[PDB]
């Protein structure tokens, strides 16, 4: 039985979407750069075998709905946030070689440490993302009649990786929330 809370009942405020512009150009920057790693390069047609993809394109250059393909994922994971009632307050001030196309530098997110405290709000962040994607997964498998699918079992019994490849996720976000220097707890 997955228990997600439900999310699109909820308005984040106009003062944290300033916030999600930082996080969705980090999305952008961190997902191009993933991609001038192996020398993909802006074009026309998504063809892998020309090491050529035509999303290889500045951030300042997609339109505020082309930015919604990164923020949709970003909005509801902080509807989970104000659900759980998690505080997102100013308290401290936020802080390969190069291909072609638009060649960012991210900031490094892994090398940044969470807390005891802030490693249980990733355990539940991911737990979330198991969740809210196996209950998506359960209806997608129950609507056409299709089979089972291994991540259908309690995060608990999951392995620490299997709840890793949703922690990874989870982890952007408190990290940036470290990095900028917010007072993240769980109140």
Same mark, same amino acid.
């Given at each position: ?25 980090? +999305?952008?920057?961190?997902? *191009?750069? $993933?991609?001038? #790693? ?5 074009? @026309?047609? &998504? ?62 997110? +892994?090398?940044?440490?969470? *807390?005891? $405290?802030?490693? #249980? ?5 991911? @737990?979330? &993302? ?58």
């Amino acid at each position: 039985n997955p228990q997600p809370v439900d999310t699109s009942n909820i308005t984040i405020p106009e003062k944290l979407e300033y916030f999600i512009n930082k996080y969705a150009e980090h +999305s952008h920057d961190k997902w *191009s750069m $993933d991609k001038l #790693a192996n020398g993909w390069i802006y074009g @026309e047609i &998504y063809s892998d075998s020309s090491k050529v993809q035509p999303l290889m394109k500045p951030y300042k250059l997609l339109s505020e709905k082309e930015k919604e393909i990164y923020r949709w994922p970003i909005k509801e994971s902080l509807k989970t946030m104000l659900a759980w009632g998690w505080r997102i307050e100013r308290t401290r001030e936020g802080d390969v070689d190069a291909a072609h196309g638009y060649s960012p530098r991210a900031i490094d997110m +892994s090398n940044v440490t969470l *807390s005891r $405290d802030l490693h #249980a709000m990733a355990e539940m962040m991911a @737990e979330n &993302y198991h969740n809210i994607w196996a209950k998506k997964k359960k209806l997608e498998l129950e609507s056409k009649g299709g089979g089972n699918h291994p991540l259908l079992v309690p995060y608990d019994t999951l392995t620490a990786k299997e709840k890793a490849k949703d922690r990874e996720k989870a982890q952007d976000i408190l990290k940036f929330l470290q990095i900028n220097g917010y007072a993240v707890s769980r109140g």
